[PDB]
Amino acid sequence: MDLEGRANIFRIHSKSMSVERGIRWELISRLCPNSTGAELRSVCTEAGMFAIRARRKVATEKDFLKAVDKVIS
């Protein structure tokens, strides 16, 4: 799945967690091409952790990059 499904997966798996608006999914996904469908999910769950790891109750676009770099390496 590369027709930017990665983008959708995020949008979908996101509307089930505390995440602020914005967060250009088109880009955040361009950082995870070879990421098999399941990988996208593993990033989201981690993203929320950084927000908690810090303090905020909502995840910002930057928390995702901090996760993608920690996940997809």
Binding site: A7, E26, L27, K62, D69
Partner: protein
């Protein structure tokens, strides 16, 4: 059920649009995926009709455009292009792209993708147009961005189409590379990586590919852009080492040392580090594998910035990515004072044992006892690796007797439902058998049977 749904659709469209036309498309599409080639029919009464539905400024409720498009995307490639061009003349596309209809755009986008000569529209403006919609920060519709991208990657094979890209748009590209605007910029980067694959030495302007030492530092202000670039370069060096394009090294050899510094300097540029640390290590692991003389460029980056060894927090990281040859020579003391056979080091073991010389530095840490201590799941991973090279196999086949057996008989090797363990184990046998009966002394019989029992079930 091919030609059945073929006309079942074409006719349901000329009607008043039944409330199941969305379902008819849904399934009739999968039937196309199966059968490769199409019958001896005329695709004019269909495409010339769907085009009317997509170009129609009027939409319909009982019609899921997403499906209707999936049908077109899988039809244009099958049927001959000469017939397709008859429904979509060279001029039709130009309009389809300039229209205010997204569903219509994505259509022509894939029609251009399957253009017969990959250098047909090479003398048109349609190519410049797509590039204009791609780097158009406004366009958010993904279904279009990709449709166009995948269309370029297929045509960028021809020599002519590339000229229309890096000669008839060279100024526009350099332009977007100048505005460096998150959305627009990123789209250009992923694009360049794709073009560098079908490009030669001459047709290579370092005014659109290579980045000035300044540009990098100026992107750090928008991490998202910085990370996207570090990966771009990492892939750029990758593409070079695999396709033996050692000519490009002369270019992307001035900025590489820049990243090393940004990585080390945490005081200033705190973001870079704990915000892209990993994606960076991915590059340093590629620079170490660069075709140079006596590892010149890297030898310095290490001695200057990436002081491998100094930082323990990274020791493991280093020995898991950085070239094993370079490691066993300029950092032999490291690979010798830390790599310990375990499910944990299972990572290092894979990269370290990549060079016979390097391996001969860790082979003193190996022993059947330390290997059989860790659970089967990890054993197979370690064993399978020791069988990915010849110098390692000889070791496992001799100095390591016990282990070899812990791979074959146990009473019922089939009692392994763990898909992962099965993978590695079954693999550790595949390459272990290629060794030939000659080498595989008394383990050939048990192997050829244990593997055979696994290959079947």
């Amino acid at each position: 059920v091919e030609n059945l749904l073929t006309q079942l659709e074409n006719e349901l469209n000329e009607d008043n649009l039944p409330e199941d036309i969305n379902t008819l498309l849904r399934k009739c599409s999968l039937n196309l995926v199966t059968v490769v080639s199409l019958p001896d029919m005329d695709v004019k009464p269909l495409l010339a009709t769907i085009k009317r539905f997509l170009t129609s400024n009027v939409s319909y409720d009982s019609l899921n455009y997403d499906y209707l498009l999936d049908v077109v995307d899988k039809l244009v490639p099958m049927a001959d292009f000469d017939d397709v061009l008859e429904v979509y003349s060279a001029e039709d596309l130009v309009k389809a792209l300039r229209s205010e209809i997204d569903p219509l755009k994505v259509a022509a986008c894939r029609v251009i993708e399957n253009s017969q000569p990959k250098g047909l529209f090479a003398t048109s403006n349609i190519i410049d147009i797509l590039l204009d919609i791609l780097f158009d920060e406004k366009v958010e519709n993904d279904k279009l961005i990709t449709a166009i991208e995948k269309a370029l990657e297929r045509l960028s094979t021809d020599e002519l189409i590339r000229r229309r890209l890096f000669d008839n748009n060279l100024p526009y590209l350099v332009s977007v590379k100048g505005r460096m605007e998150t959305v627009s910029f990123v789209r250009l980067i992923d694009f360049l990586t794709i073009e560098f694959q079908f490009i030669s030495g001459p047709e290579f302007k370092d005014i659109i590919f290579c980045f000035t030492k300044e540009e990098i530092l100026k992107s750090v202000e928008d991490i998202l852009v910085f990370i996207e670039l570090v990966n771009y370069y990492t892939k750029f060096l990758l593409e070079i080492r695999n396709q033996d394009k050692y000519w490009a090294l002369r270019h992307v050899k001035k900025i590489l040392p820049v990243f090393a510094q940004l990585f080390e300097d945490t005081e200033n540029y705190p973001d870079v580090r704990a915000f892209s640390t990993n994606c960076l290590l991915q590059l340093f692991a590629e620079v170490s594998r660069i075709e140079e003389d006596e590892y010149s460029l890297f030898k310095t980056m290490d001695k200057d910035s990436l002081k491998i060894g100094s930082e323990a927090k990274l020791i493991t990281e280093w020995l898991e990515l950085i070239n094993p040859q370079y490691l066993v020579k300029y950092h032999k003391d490291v690979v010798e004072n830390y790599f310990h056979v375990s499910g944990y080091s299972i990572g290092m073991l894979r990269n370290l044992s990549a060079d016979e010389e390097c391996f001969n530095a860790i082979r003193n840490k190996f022993s059947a006892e330390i290997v059989l201590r860790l659970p089967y799941l990890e054993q197979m991973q370690v064993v399978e690796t020791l069988t990915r090279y010849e110098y390692t196999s000889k070791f496992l086949l001799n100095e390591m007797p016990k282990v070899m057996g812990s791979l074959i008989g146990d009473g019922s090797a089939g009692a392994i439902i763990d898909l992962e363990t099965v993978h590695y184990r079954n693999s550790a046998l595949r390459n272990l058998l290629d060794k030939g009966e000659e080498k595989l002394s008394v383990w050939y019989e048990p192997l050829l049977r244990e593997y055979s029992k696994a290959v079947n079930g």
